[PDB]
């Protein structure tokens, strides 16, 4: 039945590939996503908007750890977004983990989803993502590193970096504000303030997700005993939120 | 089923025996030139060691004819080995032993390496397979030099073979060196 | 028994700040001495592994680990650490469950990051053997293991480490019949690496 | 018209283009006769012939010792249609040791023409066929069209100007109804029956082919001088 | 519009094609006495340095079995090979030779591959552009000849020709052939037909016969031969 | 689904092909990638295309000890066909116990973008490939792949958006007994003369190197940190 | 899997895809093969391309497929590549299966095959390349050249040229030369193929290439040195 | 059974036994062990004789397609080549073949390729094959000779079956002869081996050790 | 064209999806579901002489604790139910613990994201509604789109006259989360059916599905009329 075995994205008579530009197009109509990298920890943050005012928001999560040092947050469609995160935990358990015994650095895992994101933009019947995700994580070897993935595939690390409608203010503003010298709490402070510009209805704690990549939390490790055994990703409560606003 | 061999200083030196196993009146060579400066003797049970024989010298000179250019004896003697490897763990395992005779030309140096059906590969100065080991290698150990000459290696391998008929007819001995592979006419 | 065709024998110790792993040179088929010149030990950087066992195993697993080694350092930009290294071959081993190669394969090296020494065995179905003192693999495993344990000391200097493990691996494999041709020892610390040939009986 | 490009298209009145323009492939074929009695049934065949120098195309196909066809179309489809049919009689008398009915027989062929007219990458047949047989309920006539309708029917005749044959068989019903036990009247019927559709062209030894079967009578096909006292 | 599409008419546009591709190729003229069957064919040199000996529009089948073809002659590889294997295998499993009329109709399911199989693929994604003119001997029917196209459907006839000058060759062979021809005679018409029908002056390198019989089988006369016999017909037309 | 097929794979009436023109039509807006091969080196030297963000850790990568290339076009496919060569070479490696030459992994690239051209219905790769390499056949190697499966051997050669004024650029001051260092300074008055920028920074460049010795044994390869980049130039005579 | 009829009819009876190949193939360079009494020559033009060229490690366009027969080409050169390793196995097949050496019509006779089964198939593009095959079978001294087309036809010919301007030689081809007495030695034949090359290659002498095949496997790639030597000649003969 | 071909300056002689048995009880005296191939290629039937028939039947067919293709006559290297490329194919099912391939061409002269079901491919002069192989490949060799008459050489391949005959159980019925020469294979005939005894025996003397 | 196929407009959109949303509304019928502390319960405005009226219905028991509602056509609606009465039974046999709402839901969504992105399968006009009482969560109502998009719900409604009743839930939510009262909490939701649409809703122009901790049953007519 399924007679669709030739690409849907190709090259124009111009030299540029469509649906990959439809689809960044698709993102950037996509509410406003940030991520800013310190000394000593990562910050991600996104505003979380309501399809209704019955709905409980807390049961829908726009940043998802995909390992216990790693997190990510997108700007874009919703599903392919948790169509990607459940696809990009599976590889990183089964490319890495399943091998080596520990979970793959940030570089790898990003590698792994840019992999998956171009195999859209080429296999038969198929429609590219449409989404940009910004992911934040820190290993052994190479610490903290922040990197964004475009639709096609393309992934950039970044110092921080913003996604979405208010994309080109919130970078201005950034570039306005780095000074290689932040800790995790400056970059907190700087992330919220770079969001209550973008935020046109209540800027709060229910309408707020923040995310760190920071230090190792055995309070988040139900067991003890082995020495060499931490998660550093961390999502902040609304109660906290609310408390540093 | 005699397949012997001797490193000397320029060249390598090949014997194999010119015998069958019935019924029948016929000369047999058990070598393929492989390159022009690489030679393969072989042994073990019929109808495989041809095939696989065959098999190995078809694919050598499509390599030579695409790049042009002649593989070394190290790459042709890894190439056997990943052969044989790959081939006992198959449904049907070549019981096939080989050695593999080749003049360097990089290198300028002769090399001689010996493969088990297994898949072990060994570089020698001298080796042998079958029984040919067990009432050669005394006589091997004793006078082996690694400067002797092509004709004292000759000499040498002369002396085998005799220890060889007496505990029993003929060998075909071949030569690699610089100038390519030949056939002894004079032994 | 596939094990015990070709023979061979590997042992490895740690030191104070050092390692040492050491083997026997024979290749045999069943009875008959082949080459006095097999090594059974290789190094991916600044890990070593001895196999043990047939010597078409111990040939296919050195090839296949050196590419795996060379793609983890491509896409990691960084060698391999000991500990991640006896996890891969943990994983290698196990993926031949039921067609698995008869090895004998032992891991020894020195953390970049902490300097800790370290030491592994395996199985060869991929089982992981950790120890603090001695990992010994081959024939002569039970000489092996009578050796090392009397004459092993927790904390030994290089130069008392070479002669201690050279000593064992000696003197058990003296009474193997199917090991001694020869005999390399490797002394590895944070900046240098000794290989030294030993003297032995041959017969 | 954009809906007669394929076999999954319905138009906006419901109506299948390529079925309809196999049927208009069938309506050019040669003219072809099928009648029966309670005893025996036949078929009267025109063949046509490219030129002078070129033999006379068969029409009719034997399946199984107690059936056949004719065929008016499209000829590589009604062999493929014809195979078909041989197997499956083979099937019938291999596993169970029985004879297949020519319903049974029908209803198999409306199955596989109905697959070729819903899935896309296959054209429906371009051939109808009209199929005799005799089993233990006597002598079966069948009309098969490439949409997978079958009919059963006393008389029928297919292809170009068979409607005069068709008014001609309708006419005379109950007289070739009752013709028991004569074979040779009911071959005589039929001929006359084909008679009624010819223009310019009169039945010769070359262009007409019959066959019959019946209560003691495998399927038989006559041709040539078999078919002068026919004539 | 598919491969399988039918027109309003009721036929197959790529058969129709096909059949108006076969229209462009060289003349292929068969004649089918009661001595034995004649084909014969004209070879259209695109360039004075090509080599004629090297074009082969006629070839053996089995030994008494001949084809000659005309159209996309890079189509007919695959059907001759299928043609013989045919034939070899037939052989095999019963100890016989096959007959003609089998052998065309193996090779008619073959073209019919482009849909469904005789037996019930898609092997080919488009018809064969060329048309066959398969001659034989046997047993049961004497000698025949058959023209056989890309639709499937063969016919047996007296005498054929095909390619680009078909109508006027098969104009002229409807008043010419009789069933009392002798093999010569047979010889001598199709090199007249080939002579009328082609725009060049009639030669050895231009055209070639063969002919079929049930002695010496299947065999193609070499240029000598064709030489006497177009100095003997030159003779007796002038 | 037929209406929807964009027959990727087909000729035009002039006999070319449609995607592959429009694939190096999309390539020609890439950053400047450039190779220039001397009597004892190569060098690559790619013009990124920026931010103040992070750059020390996206168009030089690696493929085994030996051999490393210049993307040109689609990172993401690109970083495919690395996958695919690092893979070969690996492969080379085990079977023969020897490095890989770098024509043979060059051709089998080439031979994975053509079959893409010519077969399946998918687009081809929108990536050229610039390739430095050495072997004991013909010592240092330089390469060019494109997406119409065609490669090419070079002396010094360019690709990207301004591919005819690097190379009538080189065409001149270009010698066959150059050496390293004059190389580097040629293509970095090359990729300064031709980029349509301000100047020519130390962020907004990737080089590398591929010589004998600089502690290491018979060939290294020395990929360049921004602070080795930023000396070059200033030795050089950039000063940017 | 993608089988999509590319290759299909056209109410005139032609086939579309085929045409176009023959076009692509009208695109390419020029080759020239001429037979001798004993020897075959073939000749082929270089792309005026930059002068930054490396010859060593480019394609010659000149592939032995076996140590007594080679190929040309015109038209894309990746499907030829394609096509030449094809035949290169095929050859080693047969000499495995057989116990001697292809003739030089079988394996003309292979690629036609080949040709015409993409020509044929679905999901796939004809080649858009048109070749020369020459040679000497084995213990035969009678030189064979075949030319085989994108369709899938091939013939022997006693000089033929494809790719580009390929009407303008062969008509000096017609012209000049004499079935009845083919050049005798190979030096006639290699000066009858440059200056039916120089015919259209006005760019000089350097974009010339020649070989020469003769029986019992002597295949020579003449160097640059003697093809200017030829070329030289040619011109000092031109007006006295 | 008892199968024997030789090459000499005439050509080829192959010469077979008609014995076959299943146990102790004779099942045929009337076996054909010379499969024909095609009018100029021989092969003999040692070990199981429907593999044999058919595979050499097969042969034949593979050898008509190769002359169809290539317009020439095949060699008897490339058809020996074919069986034994496709017993290969078939090493460890079960198969038992041992057959010998006789065959005169322009090029190769005459040429015996002995084929064996392991993949044992060997260009010869002299085969036997058969329980009673060793009592004819004395007689052969006490007098084979290259420049022997087409009749002597007739007479020697009767000779040496009659000797296996004589001697194995399992051999004997009656002698098939045939010779090969570079136009084709010619039969000479059947010839009784009780009858033929005695008359041997009369005319050279020997078999003292029988009555008769 | 772009609107034909699932992929995207120049303007970043997907048609058939907003094609498939307006399908959603072919049937003029709305559907309730409210949240009680203990139970969940859903309505729906089941609306010819000839039809058998037990066999009318669009309220289906996914397992022996989760409901659904569907909007839309009914096929798509059937399909949907099998899909998920397979899903339940298969996790439940795989991991040995009753399969969850929200889980259930997510797998839903995940099918109907694969429909939008791949071509050749379409979108199903439809839109699920699940309710369950959790044996971690409590009362659960969580709806999926053709979007793939899903989300949990104190309260939600669904039709074409939704925005009425939503505007009277969140009034009554302002007042003051969930239903402080499972027959309570029905009669609820009768009443605010009738007070957002209007007229008197007799017994057979709704169809009741209530979720409470161990089950989902749907009440029959009887029960419904004892309800008013």
Avoid at chain 4, 155 to 161: E, F, P
Avoid at chain 6, 36 to 51: C, F, N, Q
Wanted: glycine share 8%; aromatic share 8%; proline share 3%.
């Amino acid at each position: 039945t399924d007679r669709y075995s030739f690409s849907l994205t190709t090259f124009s008579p111009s030299g540029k590939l469509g649906q990959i530009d439809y689809a960044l197009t698709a993102v950037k109509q996509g509410v406003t996503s940030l991520g800013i990298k310190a000394t000593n920890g990562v910050v991600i943050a996104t505003e979380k908007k309501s399809s209704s005012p019955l709905a409980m928001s807390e049961t829908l999560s726009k940043v998802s750890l995909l390992t216990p040092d790693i997190g990510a947050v997108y700007s874009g469609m919703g599903p392919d977004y948790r169509v990607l995160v459940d696809k990009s935990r599976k590889v990183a358990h089964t490319s890495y983990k399943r091998i080596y015994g520990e979970y793959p650095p940030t570089k790898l895992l990003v590698s792994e989803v840019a992999k998956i994101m171009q195999e859209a933009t080429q296999s038969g019947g198929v429609r590219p993502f449409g989404v940009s995700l910004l992911i934040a994580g820190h290993d052994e070897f190479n610490g903290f590193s922040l990197y964004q993935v475009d639709p096609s595939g393309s992934y950039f690390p970044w110092k921080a970096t913003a996604i979405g409608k208010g994309s080109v203010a919130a970078k201005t503003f950034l570039e306005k504000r780095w000074n290689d010298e932040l800790e995790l709490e400056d970059a907190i402070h700087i992330a919220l303030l770079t969001l209550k510009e973008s935020v046109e209805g209540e800027f709060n704690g229910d309408t707020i997700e923040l995310a760190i990549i920071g230090d190792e939390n055995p309070d988040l490790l139900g067991y003890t005993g082995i020495p060499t055994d931490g998660p550093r990703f961390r999502k902040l409560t609304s109660q906290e939120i609310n408390d540093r606003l | 089923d005699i397949i012997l061999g001797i490193r000397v200083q320029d060249s390598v030196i090949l014997a194999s025996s010119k015998a069958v196993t019935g019924i029948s009146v016929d000369s047999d060579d058990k070598t393929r030139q492989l390159s022009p400066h690489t030679l393969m003797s072989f042994a073990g049970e019929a109808g495989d060691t041809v095939q696989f024989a065959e098999y190995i010298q078809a694919n050598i000179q499509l390599y030579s004819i695409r790049e042009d250019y002649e593989l070394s004896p190290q790459a042709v003697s890894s190439f056997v080995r990943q052969e044989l490897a790959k081939s006992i763990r198959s449904r049907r395992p070549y019981q096939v032993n080989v050695l593999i005779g080749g003049y360097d030309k990089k290198k300028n140096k002769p090399e001689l390496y010996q493969i088990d059906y297994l898949g072990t590969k060994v570089e020698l100065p001298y080796g042998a397979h079958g029984y040919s080991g067990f009432y050669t290698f005394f006589l091997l150990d004793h006078h082996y030099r690694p400067d002797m000459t092509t004709e004292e290696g000759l000499d040498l391998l002369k002396l085998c073979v005799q220890e060889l008929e007496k505990r029993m007819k003929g060998v075909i001995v071949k030569i690699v060196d610089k100038d390519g592979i030949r056939q002894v006419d004079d032994f | 028994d596939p094990s015990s065709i070709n023979g061979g024998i590997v042992v490895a110790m740690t030191g104070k700040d050092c390692v040492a792993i050491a083997c026997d040179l024979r290749l045999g088929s069943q009875s008959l001495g082949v080459s006095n010149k097999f090594e059974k030990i290789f190094h991916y950087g600044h890990v070593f592994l001895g196999i043990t066992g047939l010597a078409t195993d111990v040939t296919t697993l050195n090839e296949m680990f050196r590419y795996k080694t060379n793609l983890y350092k491509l896409k990691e930009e960084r060698a391999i650490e000991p500990e991640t290294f006896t996890q891969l071959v943990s994983s290698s081993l196990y993926e031949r469950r039921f067609g698995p190669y008869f090895v004998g394969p032992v891991v020894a090296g020195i953390n970049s990051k902490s300097g800790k020494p370290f030491i592994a065995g395996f199985d060869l179905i991929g089982c992981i053997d950790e120890a603090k003192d001695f990992i010994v693999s081959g024939t002569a495993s039970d000489q092996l293991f009578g050796m090392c344990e009397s004459l092993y000391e927790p904390n030994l200097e290089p130069e008392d480490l070479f002669e201690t493990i050279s000593q064992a691996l000696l003197n058990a494999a003296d009474r193997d019949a199917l090991s001694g041709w020869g005999a390399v020892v490797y002394i590895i610390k944070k900046d240098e690496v000794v290989k030294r040939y030993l003297k032995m009986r041959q017969d | 018209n954009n809906y007669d490009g394929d076999t999954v298209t319905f138009s906006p009145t419901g109506r299948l283009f390529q079925v309809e323009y196999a049927l208009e492939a069938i309506k050019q074929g040669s003219v072809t006769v099928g009648l029966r009695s309670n005893t025996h049934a036949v078929l009267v065949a025109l063949k046509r012939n490219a030129d002078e120098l070129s033999s006379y195309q068969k029409k009719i196909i034997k399946c199984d010792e107690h059936m056949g066809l004719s065929l008016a179309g499209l000829a590589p489809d009604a062999r493929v249609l014809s195979n078909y049919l041989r197997q499956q009689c083979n099937y019938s008398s291999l596993v169970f040791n029985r004879k297949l009915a020519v319903e049974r027989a029908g209803h198999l062929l409306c199955d596989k023409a109905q697959k070729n007219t819903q899935s896309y990458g296959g054209r429906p047949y371009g051939v109808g066929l009209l199929i005799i047989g005799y089993d233990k309920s006597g002598a079966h006539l069948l009309e098969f069209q490439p949409s997978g309708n079958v009919t059963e029917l006393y008389g029928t005749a297919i292809g170009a100007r068979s409607q005069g044959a068709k008014t001609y068989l309708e006419r005379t019903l109950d007289t070739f109804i009752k013709i028991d036990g004569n074979p040779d009247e009911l071959i005589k019927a039929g001929v006359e029956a084909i008679s009624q559709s010819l223009r310019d062209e009169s039945l010769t030894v070359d262009n007409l082919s019959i066959a019959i079967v019946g209560k003691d009578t495998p399927f038989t096909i006559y041709d040539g001088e078999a078919v002068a006292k026919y004539i | 519009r598919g491969v399988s599409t039918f027109s309003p008419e009721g036929r197959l546009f790529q058969v129709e094609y096909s059949l108006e591709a076969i229209k462009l190729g060289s003349t292929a003229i068969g004649i089918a006495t009661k001595e034995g069957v004649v084909l014969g064919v004209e070879k259209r040199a695109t360039s004075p340095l090509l080599e004629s000996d090297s074009i082969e529009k006629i070839v053996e089948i089995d030994r008494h079995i001949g084809c000659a073809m005309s159209g996309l002659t890079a189509d007919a590889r695959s059907m001759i090979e299928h043609a013989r294997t045919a034939a070899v295998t037939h052989n095999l499993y019963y100890d016989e030779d096959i007959n003609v009329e089998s052998l065309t109709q193996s090779v008619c399911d073959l073209a019919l591959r482009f849909g469904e199989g005789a037996s019930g693929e898609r092997l080919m994604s488009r018809p064969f552009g060329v048309a066959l003119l398969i001659a034989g001997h046997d047993a049961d029917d004497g000698y025949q000849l058959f023209h056989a196209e890309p639709s499937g459907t063969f016919y047996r006839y007296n005498a054929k020709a095909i390619g680009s000058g078909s109508e006027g060759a098969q104009a002229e062979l409807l008043n010419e052939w009789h069933s009392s021809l002798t093999l010569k005679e047979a010889e001598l018409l199709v090199l007249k037909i080939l002579k009328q029908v082609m725009e060049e002056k009639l030669d050895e390198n231009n055209a070639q016969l063969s002919c079929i019989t049930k002695q010496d089988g299947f065999k193609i006369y070499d240029n000598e031969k064709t030489a006497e016999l177009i100095k003997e017909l030159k003779e007796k037309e002038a | 689904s037929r209406r929807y097929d964009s027959r990727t794979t087909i000729f035009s009436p002039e006999g070319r092909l449609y995607q592959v023109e429009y694939a190096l039509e999309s390539i020609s807006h890439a950053g400047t990638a450039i190779g220039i091969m001397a009597s004892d080196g190569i060098v690559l030297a790619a013009e990124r295309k920026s931010t103040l963000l992070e750059q020390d850790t996206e168009k030089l990568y690696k493929l085994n000890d030996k051999i490393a290339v210049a993307v040109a076009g689609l990172t993401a496919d690109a970083e495919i066909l690395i996958n695919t060569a690092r893979i070969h070479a690996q492969n080379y490696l085990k079977t023969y116990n020897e490095d890989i030459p770098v024509e043979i992994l060059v051709r089998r690239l080439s031979d994975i973008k053509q079959g893409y051209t010519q077969h399946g219905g998918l687009r081809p790769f929108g990536v050229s490939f610039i390739y430095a390499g050495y072997d004991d056949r013909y010592g240092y190697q330089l390469y060019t792949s494109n997406p119409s499966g065609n490669y090419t051997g070079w002396k010094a050669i360019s690709v990207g958006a301004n591919t005819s004024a690097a190379q009538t650029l080189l065409q001149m001051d270009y010698k066959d007994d150059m050496k390293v260092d004059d190389a580097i300074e040629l293509a970095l008055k090359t990729l300064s003369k031709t980029t349509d920028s301000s100047a020519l920074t130390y962020d907004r460049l990737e080089f590398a190197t591929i010589r004998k010795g600089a502690n290491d044994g018979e060939v290294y390869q020395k990929i360049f940190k921004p602070q080795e980049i930023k000396d070059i130039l200033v030795k050089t005579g950039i000063t940017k | 899997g993608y089988d999509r009829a590319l290759s299909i009819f056209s109410p005139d009876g032609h086939i579309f895809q085929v045409e176009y190949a023959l076009e692509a193939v009208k695109r390419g360079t020029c080759a020239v093969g001429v037979k001798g009494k004993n020897c075959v020559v073939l000749g082929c033009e270089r792309r005026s391309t930059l002068k930054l060229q490396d010859t060593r490690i480019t394609p010659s366009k000149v592939s032995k497929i076996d140590s007594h027969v080679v190929l040309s080409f015109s038209g894309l050169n990746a499907d030829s590549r394609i096509l030449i390793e094809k035949a290169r196995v095929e050859a080693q097949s047969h000499r495995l299966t057989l116990e001697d050496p292809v003739t030089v019509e079988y394996l003309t006779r292979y690629v036609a095959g080949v040709q015409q089964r993409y020509t044929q198939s679905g999901g796939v593009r004809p080649f858009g390349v048109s070749t020369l095959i020459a040679g000497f079978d084995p213990r035969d001294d009678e030189p064979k050249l075949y030319q085989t087309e994108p369709s899938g036809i091939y013939s022997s010919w006693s000089a033929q040229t494809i790719g580009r301007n390929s009407k303008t030689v062969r008509e000096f081809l017609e012209k000049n030369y004499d079935r009845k007495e083919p050049p005798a030695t190979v030096e006639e034949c290699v000066k009858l193929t440059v200056r039916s090359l120089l015919e259209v290659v006005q760019t000089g002498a350097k974009n010339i290439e020649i070989t020469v095949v003769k029986p019992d496997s002597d295949i020579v790639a003449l160097s640059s040195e003697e093809i200017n030597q030829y070329v030289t000649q040619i011109e000092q003969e031109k007006q006295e | 059974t008892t199968t024997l071909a030789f090459r000499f300056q005439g050509g080829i002689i192959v010469a077979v036994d008609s014995r076959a048995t299943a146990g102790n009880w004779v099942a045929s005296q009337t076996v054909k062990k010379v499969i024909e191939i095609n009018p100029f290629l021989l092969g003999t039937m040692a070990g199981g004789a429907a593999d044999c028939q058919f595979w050499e039947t097969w042969l034949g067919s593979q050898c008509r397609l190769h002359e169809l293709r290539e317009k020439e006559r095949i060699s008897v290297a490339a058809a020996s080549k074919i069986l034994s490329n496709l017993v290969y194919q078939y090493k460890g099912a079960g198969l038992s073949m041992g057959t010998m391939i006789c065959g005169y061409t322009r090029k190769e002269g005459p040429t015996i390729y002995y084929v064996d079901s392991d993949g044992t491919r060997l260009k010869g002069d002299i085969f036997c094959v058969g329980s009673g192989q060793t009592f004819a490949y004395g007689v052969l060799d006490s007098n084979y000779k290259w420049d022997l008459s087409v009749e002597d050489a007739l007479y020697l391949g009767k000779r040496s079956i009659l000797a296996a005959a004589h001697r194995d159980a399992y051999s004997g019925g009656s002698v098939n002869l045939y010779h090969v020469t570079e136009d084709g294979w010619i039969y000479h005939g059947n010839h009784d081996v009780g009858e033929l005894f005695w008359k041997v025996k009369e005319e050279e003397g020997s078999f003292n050790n029988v009555i008769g | 064209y772009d609107r034909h196929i699932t992929i995207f407009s120049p303007e970043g959109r997907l048609y058939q999806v907003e094609y498939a949303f307006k399908a959603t509304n072919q049937t003029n019928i709305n559907s309730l579901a409210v949240r009680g502390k203990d139970c969940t319960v859903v309505i729906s405005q089941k609306k010819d002489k000839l039809l058998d009226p037990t066999t009318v219905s669009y309220i289906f028991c996914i397992s022996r604790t989760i409901g659904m509602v569907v909007n839309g056509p009914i096929p798509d609606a059937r399909n949907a139910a099998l899909r998920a009465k397979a899903e339940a039974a298969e996790f439940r046999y795989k991991y040995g613990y009753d399969m969850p709402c929200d889980v259930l839901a997510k797998r839903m969504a995940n099918l109907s994201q694969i429909y939008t992105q791949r071509a050749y399968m379409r979108p199903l006009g439809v839109i699920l509604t699940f309710v369950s009482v959790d044996e971690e969560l409590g009362p659960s109502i969580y709806k999926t789109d053709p979007a793939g998009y899903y989300v949990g719900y104190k309260a939600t409604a669904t039709g074409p006259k939704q925005q009425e009743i939503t505007t009277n839930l969140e009034n009554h939510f302002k007042k003051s989360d969930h239903i402080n009262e499972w027959e309570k909490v029905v009669e609820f939701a009768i009443t605010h059916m009738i007070d957002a649409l209007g007229t008197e809703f007799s017994k057979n122009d709704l169809e009741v599905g209530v979720a409470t901790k161990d089950k989902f049953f749907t009440l029959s007519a009887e029960n419904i009329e004892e309800r008013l």
